[PDB]
A paper describes a structure:
In the present study, a vaccine antigen based on the fusion of two known NTHi adhesive proteins, [name] (PE) and a pilin subunit ([name]), was developed. PE is a ubiquitous NTHi antigen described to be important for the adhesion of the bacterium to epithelial cells. It is also known to bind vitronectin, which protects the bacterium from complement attack, and immunization with a fragment of PE was shown to afford protection in a mouse model of pulmonary clearance. [name] is another ubiquitous NTHi antigen described to be a conserved protein among [name] isolates. It is the major subunit of type IV pili (Tfp), which are hair-like filaments involved in adherence through ICAM-1 (25).
PE crystallized in space group C2 with a monomer in the asymmetric unit, but crystal packing revealed a head-to-tail dimer on the crystallographic 2-fold axis that had an interface area of approximately 950 Å2, as determined by the software Protein Interfaces, Surfaces and Assemblies (PISA) run within the COOT model-building tool. The PE monomer comprises a β-sheet with six antiparallel β-strands and two C-terminal α-helices, with one of these being formed by heterologous amino acids added in the PE construct used for the crystallization. A disulfide bond exists between Cys81 and Cys130, linking the main α-helix with the end of β4, which confirms the mass spectrometry data (see below). The PE crystal structure is comparable to the published structure, as revealed by their superposition. The recently published crystal structure of PE showed a noncrystallographic symmetry dimer that the authors suggest is the dimer observed in solution, despite the relatively low interface area (∼625 Å2). It was the largest interface in their crystal system, but this type of dimer has not been observed in our crystal systems. The contrasting types of PE dimers observed may simply be due to differences in crystallization conditions.
Numbering used by the authors: 24 to 170
The structure:
C-alpha cells in the first residue's frame, strides 16, 4: 500500500521531443526515428508519456516512474502500428532508471480515420513520403501547426 504521488509533468517541452496529440503529454522522441534502407516505409520510433502520477513498478517498493517509453513500428504502407516494448523511467522524458515487465507481447493495429494516432501517423508518413526520410524540423512544425 504505497501513497499516491502527484507529479508536476513539465509543461515546458524538452528539445527533441514532439507533442503527438493536442494538450496531452504524449510525445514522439525525434532522436528515435529510424527507417531501415532494406524496409522503406517502416518507421521505427519511441513514444514517450510524462506521467501525472507515480507508478510503483520497481523492485524497490518506494521508487516510482515519472515517464513511459514505448517502442513502436509504424508501417506507412498499410497504416499498421506495432507496439513492441513498454519501459518505465524514473525521470521525465523516458530517461533515468528503467523498469520493464518481463518478456512482452508485440501487438499490431490498424489506424482508421477514427483512431487516436491516425492523425499523427498520417502526418509522419506524409512527411516521410516526400523524401523517404523524415525531416524532423518539418515534422515538429507540422504537428505544432496542426495543434
Ligand atoms: Cl531542453
Amino acid at each position: 500500500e504505497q501513497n499516491d504521488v502527484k507529479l508536476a509533468p513539465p509543461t515546458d517541452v524538452r528539445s527533441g521531443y514532439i507533442r503527438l496529440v493536442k494538450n496531452v503529454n504524449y510525445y514522439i522522441d525525434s532522436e528515435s526515428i529510424w527507417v531501415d534502407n532494406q524496409e522503406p516505409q517502416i518507421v521505427h520510433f519511441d513514444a514517450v508519456v510524462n506521467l501525472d502520477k507515480g507508478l510503483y513498478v520497481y523492485p524497490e517498493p518506494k521508487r516510482y516512474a515519472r515517464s513511459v517509453r514505448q517502442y513502436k513500428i509504424l508501417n506507412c504502407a498499410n497504416y499498421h502500428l506495432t507496439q513492441v516494448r513498454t519501459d518505465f523511467y524514473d525521470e521525465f522524458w523516458g530517461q533515468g532508471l528503467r523498469a520493464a515487465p518481463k518478456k512482452q507481447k508485440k501487438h499490431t493495429l490498424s489506424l482508421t480515420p477514427d483512431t487516436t494516432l491516425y492523425n499523427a501517423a498520417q502526418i509522419i508518413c506524409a512527411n516521410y513520403g516526400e523524401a523517404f526520410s523524415v525531416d524532423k524540423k518539418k515534422l515538429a512544425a507540422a504537428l505544432e501547426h496542426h495543434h
